[PDB]
Design an enzyme around this catalytic site. Structure first.
Site, short mmCIF file in Angstrom:
data_model
loop_
_atom_site.label_atom_id
_atom_site.label_comp_id
_atom_site.label_asym_id
_atom_site.label_seq_id
_atom_site.Cartn_x
_atom_site.Cartn_y
_atom_site.Cartn_z
N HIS A 159 -53.52 75.32 49.93
CA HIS A 159 -52.54 75.99 49.08
C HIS A 159 -52.46 77.51 49.31
O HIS A 159 -51.65 78.17 48.66
CB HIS A 159 -52.71 75.65 47.59
CG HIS A 159 -54.03 76.02 46.97
ND1 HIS A 159 -54.41 77.34 46.81
CD2 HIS A 159 -54.95 75.22 46.37
CE1 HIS A 159 -55.57 77.30 46.17
NE2 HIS A 159 -55.93 76.04 45.88
N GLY B 53 -58.89 84.50 41.72
CA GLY B 53 -59.16 84.39 43.14
C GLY B 53 -60.36 83.56 43.50
O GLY B 53 -60.93 83.74 44.58
N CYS C 142 -60.52 80.20 44.11
CA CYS C 142 -60.34 79.03 44.99
C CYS C 142 -61.07 79.19 46.31
O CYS C 142 -61.19 80.30 46.82
CB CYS C 142 -58.88 78.69 45.19
SG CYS C 142 -58.04 78.15 43.68
C1 LIG Z 1 -57.30 79.68 43.07
N1 LIG Z 1 -57.54 80.78 43.68
C2 LIG Z 1 -56.14 79.71 42.14
C3 LIG Z 1 -54.84 79.29 42.85
N2 LIG Z 1 -54.57 77.97 42.30
C4 LIG Z 1 -53.57 77.11 42.85
C5 LIG Z 1 -53.54 75.76 42.52
C6 LIG Z 1 -52.50 74.96 42.97
C7 LIG Z 1 -51.53 75.54 43.76
C8 LIG Z 1 -50.44 74.72 44.40
F1 LIG Z 1 -49.60 75.46 45.16
F2 LIG Z 1 -49.69 74.07 43.47
F3 LIG Z 1 -50.94 73.76 45.18
N3 LIG Z 1 -51.54 76.85 44.09
C9 LIG Z 1 -52.54 77.61 43.65
C10 LIG Z 1 -55.37 77.67 41.22
O1 LIG Z 1 -55.32 76.67 40.53
N4 LIG Z 1 -56.21 78.75 41.03
C11 LIG Z 1 -57.26 78.78 40.07
C12 LIG Z 1 -58.43 78.04 40.18
N5 LIG Z 1 -59.44 78.06 39.31
C13 LIG Z 1 -59.31 78.84 38.24
C14 LIG Z 1 -58.17 79.63 37.97
C15 LIG Z 1 -58.05 80.43 36.81
C16 LIG Z 1 -56.91 81.16 36.59
C17 LIG Z 1 -55.87 81.14 37.50
C18 LIG Z 1 -55.95 80.38 38.64
C19 LIG Z 1 -57.11 79.60 38.91
#
Ligand SMILES: *C(=N)[C@H]1CN(c2ccc(C(F)(F)F)nc2)C(=O)N1c1cncc2ccccc12
Ligand SMILES: *C(=N)[C@H]1CN(c2ccc(C(F)(F)F)nc2)C(=O)N1c1cncc2ccccc12
Lengths: 297, 297
Positions: A41, A143, A145
């Site tokens: 992603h 950030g 991920c």
């Molecule tokens: C991880 N850095 C971020 C980004 N993210 C994410 C999930 C799905 C998608 C897509 F495009 F749909 F596939 N894009 C980006 C995501 O869920 N993130 C994440 C992860 N863990 C915790 C948090 C907390 C707050 C905000 C984002 C989070």
């Protein structure tokens, strides 16, 4: 004596954390040998998020678009491949500090250490338990991920988790190192409800065995419940199925308390502890495996 | 989102763990520069334990009697000094992997990471909170003495704890790096009862601020209690005195919820949660400081 949620030391995994950057999005990666693993992603624009076509997205992407950064050392991409929901990036430089590693998969109830990282810099570590919902109750921000979850087997790092998504408040999930998501979860910006969770029975039996060895045994009575009968009851009382572990047998010998005595206790405790704590708690503490408590006894 | 008890990464402290051996007793030490710190009770025979005369014991001890071992690398003792309840051993070899370190002291409510070690080999790490009893609820076994507790301040390791004793089941204490014991505890085999403990008020306020930012605010009402009036009530209700932290003010701005609103909530919660959880718990979760929750928000 005493029981806590312990993490594995982090020195074998810290030298493998890298920053992975594509356009205006920066997340974390794992640099092992001449390869960098990270969530796919990273190539998603905020417009192509609800139902992303990753094969179409990887057409307009070159190795040069990827900026891998170990601390302030820039790494050069040779090629890239999509392995499920994970990107694998071949770099020109071998990670000299690659530990003896293996790629594994955790089952519900199993525990591992998450090395939380932001911008390729490890911030700290925490103990998690894979739930029957195929999620972990972690602590991750913007950030995070690409942060990895691992377990040390002797001198080997078994990497089992790569942070990918926050499904709901305090509810996190990701993939194994084959790029496969735990549970039915997907990397798309859609509403994702959770798989049914249960109290991890063998982990609560582990807490009871450790409580007996920590001078707390009020819950031990004459009552006895076989594995087979407890499993039938568990189906409609929020408890997971019990499989007798080899470590459970070892704990039974150390205490002289059979597993069947503890399964009967669990059923009584379901209708209340009545103000009595078991090692400072009146809850079904199911976050430590039998072998997590064995190492502390 | 999500709140967990996190530990600092362990790579700066792992290269400083050594084995310290005297006669038939082996415990852990910290090798910093050309010095090795360890509990002085390593020179105690099972006969001289109830009331040990350490000055008399150090007469019949030479540098040669001490066997310091970093992994399988034997270190040679030049001289030794007793600094309170701690032995400081000058070695001939400088620890090339000595981090930027400082020697500090934790107050009740403050948190740190313990790197548990057995035979100079780190086994894992865990998060602890110094209690008002000047003890920690750790997990330590037979050869765990000399395991260190530390906190990373930027790029500096603040070493604050050296494991020395198990006072009671799951109740642990030790010294700071000046050789001084936390609380009135002594290194003697005598019955040692615990100092009065309390619920760490500012840490429970930190849990409430984090709960508000984790979509849980049922406990917020019209009610308001000043710091001064809450402190008077706390004296006879098992709560510690509140001092407004700079991080508390930052958390108050992020939520729009004043500290005074949360002190009133604490008093209501003292007579019961009534089946309502705050981030999965019906207890006074007081193990995370305001700045521990701030880093996860
Ligand atoms: C991880 N850095 C971020 C980004 N993210 C994410 C999930 C799905 C998608 C897509 F495009 F749909 F596939 N894009 C980006 C995501 O869920 N993130 C994440 C992860 N863990 C915790 C948090 C907390 C707050 C905000 C984002 C989070
Ligand atoms: C630490 N390795 C051991 C030894 N120990 C100890 C305390 C006091 C004294 C003396 F001589 F009175 F000053 N001697 C030895 C001690 O308390 N240990 C310890 C520490 N933490 C946990 C445990 C668990 C089980 C047994 C010993 C423990």
């Amino acid at each position: 004596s005493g029981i806590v949620k312990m993490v594995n030391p982090t020195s074998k995994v810290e030298p493998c954390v890298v920053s992975v950057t594509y356009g205006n999005m920066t997340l974390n990666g794992l640099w092992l040998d001449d390869k960098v693993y990270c969530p796919r992603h990273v190539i998603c624009s905020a417009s192509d998020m609800t139902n992303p076509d990753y094969t179409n997205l990887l057409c307009r992407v070159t190795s040069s678009d990827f900026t891998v950064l170990f601390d302030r050392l820039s790494l050069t991409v040779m090629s890239y491949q999509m392995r499920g929901c994970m990107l694998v990036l071949t770099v020109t430089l071998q990670n000299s500090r690659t530990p003896k590693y293996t790629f594994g998969v955790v089952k519900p109830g199993e525990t591992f250490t998450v090395l939380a990282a932001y911008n390729g810099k490890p911030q700290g570590a925490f103990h998690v338990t894979m739930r029957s919902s195929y999620t972990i109750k972690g602590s991750f921000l913007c950030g995070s991920c690409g942060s990895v979850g691992y377990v040390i087997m002797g001198d080997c790092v078994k990497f089992v988790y790569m942070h990918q998504l926050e499904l709901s408040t305090g509810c996190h999930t990701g993939t194994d190192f084959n790029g496969d998501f735990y549970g039915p979860y997907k990397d798309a910006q859609v509403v994702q409800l959770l798989i049914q969770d249960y109290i991890q029975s063998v982990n609560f039996v582990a807490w009871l065995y450790a409580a007996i060895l920590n001078n707390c045994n009020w819950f031990v009575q004459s009552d006895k419940c076989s594995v087979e009968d407890f499993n039938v009851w568990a189906l409609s009382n929020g408890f997971s199925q019990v499989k007798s572990d080899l470590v459970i047998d070892a704990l039974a010998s150390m205490t002289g308390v059979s597993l069947e005595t503890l399964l009967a206790a669990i059923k009584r405790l379901k209708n209340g502890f009545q103000g009595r704590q078991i090692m400072g708690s009146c809850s079904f503490e199911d976050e430590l495996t039998p072998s997590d408590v064995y190492q502390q006894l």
